[PDB]
């Protein structure tokens, strides 16, 4: 492993643990002697794993008071209906548009179907509360989340990966929970792979804004662990650079009369291995195709 990337379950910092699978992690913040928060909402099939991990750190789960959600994608909120019943005092903090997704019958259907595809034949999920019954509080762009005496995180709108996406900035710790707004970190090559699934202009503009934050010390995306050192400090800029690189590549191949399916297959070839254990089957190729369609339209 690489000294600039913490990618093991367990303790990451004095106040911070990684629960579950590093590829779809749930982060545990210690807010005080009797108060905790969760960050990122994972995939449903990981309910009992994340629960087991949680209970090793939290002896009384009624002390879990907040659960912060970056966006509505199935791999970032799948745990909520299954673990919220076990967390009687928790408040789910999510953007207005993320909360709307949980009231949309069609949207919930997609989230459930994609999560159901990841169940091993053996396992049954816990008893769930309704998606429209989650204990949510909508948070706004720029709102300060006063989680505890040493934990103050700002909500920052970061649309473009999805139309609801937000990030959470802990300025005391120069720590950004950035979800998927910078893309997928390539663990073999150390660069960002873009994840532009809604709007390229918004994705780039969000990265421009995130570069203006005070220098990061810890950068925590939706997948793959915690980045530090130069990877944190340069992350938002590097993600922006890699998105333009893919645009130029797309423009290059199209200028040679190539269909979108060619670069789609190449990108699936080069990039799909990392997420195969939580991204079911055809979705990664289809996602690459959707991203190239978006880039091709807005360029
Ligand atoms: O395609 C992905 N996710 C996804 C999930 C849910 C919906 C849509 C989506 C919406 C429109 N087109 N596609 C896309 C993906 C691919 C590779 C690594 C990661 C990490 N997080 N996600 C990743
Ligand atoms: Fe996503
Ligand atoms: Fe994701």
From Swiss-Prot:
Question: SUPFAM superfamilies recorded for this chain?
Answer: Metallo-hydrolase/oxidoreductase
What does its activity-regulation comment describe? Thioesterase activity, but not pyocyanine production, is inhibited by 2-(pyridin-3-yl)benzoic acid, 2-(1H-pyrrol-1-yl)benzoic acid and 3-methylthiophene-2-carboxylic acid. Compounds bind to the active center.
Give the phenotype of cells or organisms lacking this gene: Mutant is defective in pyocyanine and rhamnolipid production and fails to kill worms efficiently, but can still produce PQS. Deletion mutant produces increased levels of DHQ, resulting from intramolecular cyclization of 2-ABA-CoA.
InterPro entries for this protein: Metallo-B-lactamas (IPR001279), NDM-1-like (IPR050855), RibonucZ/Hydroxyglut_hydro (IPR036866)
Asked if the record carries the keyword Transmembrane helix, the reply is: no
Enzyme Commission number(s) from the entry: 3.1.2.32
Q: Does the keyword tRNA-binding apply?
A: no
- Identify the keywords attached in UniProt to this record, alphabetized: Hydrolase, Iron, Metal-binding
Which positions are annotated as binding Fe cation 2? Answer: 75-76, 180, 223
GO MF entries? hydrolase activity; metal ion binding
Write down the superkingdom of origin.
Answer: Bacteria
Q: Which residues bind Fe cation 1?
A: 71, 73, 161, 180
Q: Which GO terms describe its biological process?
A: secondary metabolite biosynthetic process
* Top EC group: hydrolase
- Reaction(s) catalysed by this chain's protein: (2-aminobenzoyl)acetyl-CoA + H2O = (2-aminobenzoyl)acetate + CoA + H(+)
What PANTHER family does this protein map onto?
METALLO-BETA-LACTAMASE DOMAIN-CONTAINING (PTHR42951), METALLO-BETA-LACTAMASE DOMAIN-CONTAINING PROTEIN (PTHR42951:SF17)
**Any additional notes?**
As mutant can produce wild-type levels of PQS, it was originally thought that PqsE is not involved in HHQ/PQS biosynthesis. It was shown later that the role of PqsE can be taken over to some extent by the broad-specificity thioesterase TesB, explaining why the pqsE deletion mutant still synthesizes HHQ and PQS.
According to its UniProt entry, the function of this protein is described as:
Required for the biosynthesis of the quorum-sensing signaling molecules 2-heptyl-4(1H)-quinolone (HHQ) and 2-heptyl-3-hydroxy-4(1H)-quinolone (Pseudomonas quinolone signal or PQS), which are important for biofilm formation and virulence. Catalyzes the hydrolysis of the intermediate 2-aminobenzoylacetyl-CoA (2-ABA-CoA) to form 2-aminobenzoylacetate (2-ABA), the precursor of HHQ. In vitro, can also hydrolyze other substrates such as S-ethyl-acetothioacetate and acetoacetyl-CoA, but is inactive against anthraniloyl-CoA, malonyl-CoA and octanoyl-CoA.
Give the family per the record.
Answer: Belongs to the metallo-beta-lactamase superfamily.
Name of the protein: 2-aminobenzoylacetyl-CoA thioesterase
Species of origin reads Pseudomonas aeruginosa (strain ATCC 15692 / DSM 22644 / CIP 104116 / JCM 14847 / LMG 12228 / 1C / PRS 101 / PAO1)
* Upper taxonomic lineage: Bacteria, Pseudomonadati, Pseudomonadota, Gammaproteobacteria, Pseudomonadales
């Amino acid at each position: 492993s690489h000294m600039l990337r913490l990618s093991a379950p367990g303790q990451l910092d004095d106040d911070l643990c990684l629960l579950g699978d590093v590829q779809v992690p749930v982060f545990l913040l210690r807010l005080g002697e009797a108060s905790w928060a969760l960050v990122e909402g994972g995939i449903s099939r990981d309910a009992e794993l994340v629960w087991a991990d949680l209970c090793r750190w939290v002896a009384d789960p009624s002390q879990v008071h907040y659960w912060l959600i970056t966006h509505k994608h199935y791999d970032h909120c799948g745990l909520l209906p299954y673990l919220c019943p076990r967390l009687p005092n928790v408040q789910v903090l999510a953007s207005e548009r993320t909360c709307q997704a949980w009231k949309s019958e069609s949207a919930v259907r997609v989230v459930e179907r994609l999560n159901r595809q990841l169940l091993r034949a053996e396992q049954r999920l816990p008893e769930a509360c309704a998606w429209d019954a989650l204990p949510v509080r909508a948070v706004a762009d720029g709102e300060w989340l006063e989680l505890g005496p040493r934990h103050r995180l700002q909500v920052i709108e970061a649309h473009g990966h999805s139309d609801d996406h937000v990030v959470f900035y802990d300025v005391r710790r120069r720590r950004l929970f950035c979800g998927d707004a910078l893309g997928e970190f390539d663990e073999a090559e150390g660069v960002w792979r873009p994840l532009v699934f809604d709007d390229m202009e918004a994705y780039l503009e969000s990265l421009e804004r995130l570069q203006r934050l005070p220098t990061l010390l810890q950068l925590i995306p939706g997948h793959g662990g915690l980045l530090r050192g130069r990877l944190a400090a340069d992350g938002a800029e590097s993600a922006y650079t890699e998105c333009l690189r893919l645009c130029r590549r797309l423009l290059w191949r199209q200028s040679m009369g190539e269909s979108l399916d060619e670069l789609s297959e190449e990108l699936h070839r080069a990039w799909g291995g990392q997420s195969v254990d939580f991204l079911p089957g055809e979705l990664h190729l289809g996602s690459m195709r959707r991203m190239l369609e978006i880039l091709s339209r807005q360029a």
